[PDB]
Amino acid sequence: HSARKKPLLQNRHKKARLRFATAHGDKDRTFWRNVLWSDETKIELFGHNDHRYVWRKKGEACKPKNTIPTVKHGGGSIMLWGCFAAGGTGALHKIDGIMDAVQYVDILKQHLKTSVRKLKLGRKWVFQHDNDPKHTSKVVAKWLKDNKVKVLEWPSQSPDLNPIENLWAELKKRVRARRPTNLTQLHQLCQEEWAKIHPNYCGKLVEGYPKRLTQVKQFKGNATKY
Amino acid sequence: ARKKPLLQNRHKKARLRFATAHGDKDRTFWRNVLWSDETKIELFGHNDHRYVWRKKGEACKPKNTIPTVKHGGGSIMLWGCFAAGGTGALHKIDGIMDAVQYVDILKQHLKTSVRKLKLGRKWVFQHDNDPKHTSKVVAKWLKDNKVKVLEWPSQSPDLNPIENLWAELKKRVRARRPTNLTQLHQLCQEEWAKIHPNYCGKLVEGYPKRLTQVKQFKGNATKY
């Protein structure tokens, strides 16, 4: 008991997380390698606590002497939809404005089966997406059914169980290091760096996956470290 | 126990003369030298293992590559200068620089840089022994415009701290992974702006140690 790890941070939907984690606790490695994970993310050009050079004066790039903390600088941002599996990155798509169900269907049309083929996933491959209500809207459910897509069981409020959240941090690190100064550049750097992310990086994310399910069970469905 | 040089320099006599003749100079002297040189920055460095193409969405390096001294991305050629107090002008050279383009670059940028860097009245200009620098026209421009030129030993880039500054600019620009020459040029000017006086000053503060090593090594090649 004392020697067990006890969670300090609660998660909602702990019973659903236990149903997911216990039932997938003995799935084999091939199965996890053939899950196509997916999510959206937002990348800011000027990160809210990135100490960037803001102006040039007398030939020197300058950072401000005095700043007030903020949650959001100017400079704008890009929103992205992406997918990946253990074997590598799938499609990356810039999303414009708020995404609705019809727009989500169009994203899947284009990019889902092309990604699966490019990644050479096996015949029993499974698609993962989160529990946004748009994902079971009539038009989306019909597209998934008509295109024979198998959808992974999924608990709500569980980004610590989707390794794509690690992949986005890798993309952000690569993009940030190229020091973009405008949004056309931010877009092109996101696509270029996504294309460079190593297949072995992706593989290492998925290799670690069953340990996440072990920790969800140990923590009775509360928040994991991941 | 003494350090003994493993690599010879053909111009050890002149190097040893330079170090002897300058080894007593105060730090003020080195802070008032305006160092200068040109450098070429390749878009696709000859042994940079860059991704060359995309196929099936994946960026790819070739399965088999033969070494080369030069890839086909093109390059930018730059003239620059600096002193302990900071960067001077950075200028993109048009094609291949001849003596007239060199005089023109000096017009525009040399004394502007001395002004902006606030060098003392006895500032000195440094540049290497490229035959162009000794031409009737460059030598006459320097004399007419009252520029004092540092006496300079051949094959001695290890004694010009701007070669470190060029490597710093190249590191910064390469890390931004440019994919065309327009970007390469813009990144060079952006990154030059990020190189500050403290960096420049630390290079020059270390300079007497270079002269110490030239003397220890009897004019042969240093580590620098």
Residue numbers in the entry:
A (entry chain B): 5 to 230
B (entry chain A): 7 to 230
What does the literature reporting this entry say, word for word?
SB is a member of the widespread Tc1/mariner superfamily of DNA transposons that has been developed as a genome engineering tool in a broad range of organisms. The transposon (tnp) DNA includes terminal inverted repeats (TIRs) at its ends and encodes a transposase protein, the workhorse of transposition, that catalyses all DNA cleavage and joining reactions required for transposition. Tc1/mariner transposases contain an N-terminal bipartite PAIRED-like10 DNA-binding domain (DBD) consisting of two helix-turn-helix motifs, and a C-terminal catalytic domain with an RNaseH-like fold and a catalytic triad of three acidic residues (DDE)1 that execute DNA hydrolysis (in excision) and transesterification (in integration) in a two metal ion-dependent manner. The 39 kDa SB transposase (340 amino acids (aa)) features a similar domain composition to other Tc1/mariner transposases.
